[PDB]
Amino acid sequence: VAKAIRDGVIEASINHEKGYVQSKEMIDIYSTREPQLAFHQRISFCLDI
Amino acid sequence: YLMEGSYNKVFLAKGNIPAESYTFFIDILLDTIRDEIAGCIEKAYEKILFTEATRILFFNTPKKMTDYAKKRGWVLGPNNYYSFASQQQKPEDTTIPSTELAKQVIEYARQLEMIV
Amino acid sequence: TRPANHRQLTFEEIAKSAKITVNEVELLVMKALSVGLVKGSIDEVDKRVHMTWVQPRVLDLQQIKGMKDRLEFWCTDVKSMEMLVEHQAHDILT
Amino acid sequence: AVQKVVVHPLVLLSVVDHFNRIGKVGNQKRVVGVLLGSWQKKVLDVSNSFAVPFDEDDKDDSVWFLDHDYLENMYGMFKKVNARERIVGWYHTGPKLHKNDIAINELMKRYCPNSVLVIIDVKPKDLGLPTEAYISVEEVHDDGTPTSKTFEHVTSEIGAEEAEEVGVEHLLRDIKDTTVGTLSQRITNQVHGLKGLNSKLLDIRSYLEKVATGKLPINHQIIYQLQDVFNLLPDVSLQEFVKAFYLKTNDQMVVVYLASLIRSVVALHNLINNKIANRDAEKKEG
Known about the structure:
This is part of a larger assembly, with chains A, B, C and D.
Chain A: H1 2-6, E1 13-14, E2 21-22, H2 34-48
Antiparallel strand pairs in A: 1-2
Chain C: E1 8-10, H1 11-18, H2 25-34, E2 38-43, E3 48-54, H3 64-88
Antiparallel strand pairs in C: 1-3, 2-3
Chain D: E1 4-7, H1 9-25, E2 32-40, E3 43-51, E4 54-56, E5 64-66, H2 68-79, E6 86-92, H3 101-108, E7 116-120, E8 131-139, E9 148-158, H4 162-171, H5 182-187, H6 190-212, H7 220-232, H8 239-282
Parallel strand pairs in D: 1-3, 1-9, 6-7
Antiparallel strand pairs in D: 2-3, 2-6, 4-5, 7-8, 8-9
């Protein structure tokens, strides 16, 4: 799990003394900048064709 | 075993070589595992106990633990290890987006009306 | 006194700086707003206020130098953006 | 009082002619004349003009000569050939307004109390319009006088009539922008706007230096409005603004996407039509 957290696979934390793993909540990806990149990547293609 | 986090089996096998000692390379391997685990624990969790930290890393209780902490930060507390916490510098930024978006939109309009 | 950012401020700080008990500051700020010399809003459950505009005042030859400076290193940004755009779209109408 | 003024181009050409025409006669720095026009609602429309003889000596600020009856009877002559026009103002071609000018106005105000002053710059070096419009007002202030007498600014624009526009469009054979459309929507705009704003800020600094020292007749009203201007600037860095800006652009992009897709498929159909219209016709030559 630590190696998984290293590479950004999951952002969950771990209480080693206890043992349980708790994870963060990341929703509302629409406000993020990534969908604009997704749209641009294929705007380029449709303009090239 | 090394490609992912499975490391207990690595140290178990370090004592199992049917060929010869191979201490020459498994040594280097031990060092490059120690430093990597020291780097990875820096963000896994908020707090560790000093005995637990000393034991999860395979060294025992020598001054080596103290020296390893000294080499890094790892400021102690009352049987406590403080977490290094930041992870918030990057967000809430638009100016660099506000420039490269302008570049990108200009690029869209470039090859749109001129004959290509 | 405060910067243009960061000009939220708390009841107790007024109460000290006006040496009046907390319970009056609401009626004081209401009065101030009602005659239009300051504009803003209030939050009673946080005990905080958010002022946003204040009547101008006279100021002297030492203060205006800051105006001069902030105007210069504002204008530099306009010049930079012009020199950028007139290059990056050179071909679309040279 | 009056909210905007629209100027026809014929007065521009007339003034440009007049300036050189006087350049023949003498070493005069400036020229003056009468503006004729008409009213609709709060808007003024100005269309025709004639020059009036004028003289001034830089010996001092108080020795100048404008002729009455030339204007008096010339206006009669013009009235007798077009009844619709009334005297409605006066113009001069100085680069900036001069100290005499208010005392000039008090002369000709007798002919129309609403009279307005228009400046026409004869030598452009710049991307602002050549015209300016000024109207007189008294203004009260705490002390020094009950009222000062002051020129204040009225907004101005150039317009054109049905047939004078045909006339001007015949003449501009020599230059045009290649295409109206998004490249005109930009290059004819944003760059010009940015240049104008830069020049305004430059003039602000040029005054502010000659107030930190120099003559420095400090005027507090300037400082008041400057305080307002600097207070007005928004904080862009606020998270709740950023989330809105993304939530808008991340919507606007979808329409460009869809439209570009449609454009591509139509062009593909056009190619298919061309190729089949070729392969079924080329065979006819054997």
